């Protein structure tokens, strides 16, 4: 029987141990198809709204190359490999380094691969996360 009690107040003392937790316990995960209306992702995890920190109309609309996440300081194999690996739509990952909402930075890598049916037709593609540099 959880009251609403109508206070405030500060609070992110441990509630702030698992959100460290969250980064892995629920990694992430996220979705494309082929028929992209604006170029960018279908789906993606509660986890990776979590990691970018950004609003759920925000994270809904991101192409899966990261683009907002890379910048002219960020490594260019990341872009071209993605690319590259979204053009052929083949199993291929790769390590990006991106800005988090913390002021924060790390490399995180991602892997494409395609996601075929019953028949082996490949309608859509699935990517994933992967911590490689957590600094």
Do not use: W
Not at 8 to 23: G, S, Y
Not at 83 to 112: H, P
Not at 119 to 132: H, R
Request: net charge positive; with cysteine.
């Amino acid at each position: 029987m959880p009251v609403r009690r109508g206070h405030v107040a500060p609070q992110n003392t441990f509630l702030d141990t698992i959100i460290r937790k969250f980064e892995g316990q629920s990694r992430k995960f996220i979705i494309a198809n082929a028929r992209v209306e604006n170029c960018a992702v279908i789906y993606c995890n509660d986890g990776f709204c979590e990691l970018c920190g950004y609003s759920r109309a925000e994270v809904m609309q991101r192409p899966c190359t990261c683009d907002f996440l890379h910048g002219p300081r960020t490594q260019r194999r990341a872009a071209a490999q993605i690319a590259q690996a979204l053009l052929g739509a083949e199993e291929r990952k790769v390590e990006i380094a991106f800005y988090r909402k913390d002021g924060s930075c790390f490399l995180c890598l991602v892997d494409v691969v395609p996601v075929k049916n019953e028949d082996g037709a490949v309608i859509m593609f699935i990517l994933n996360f992967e911590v490689v540099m957590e600094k």
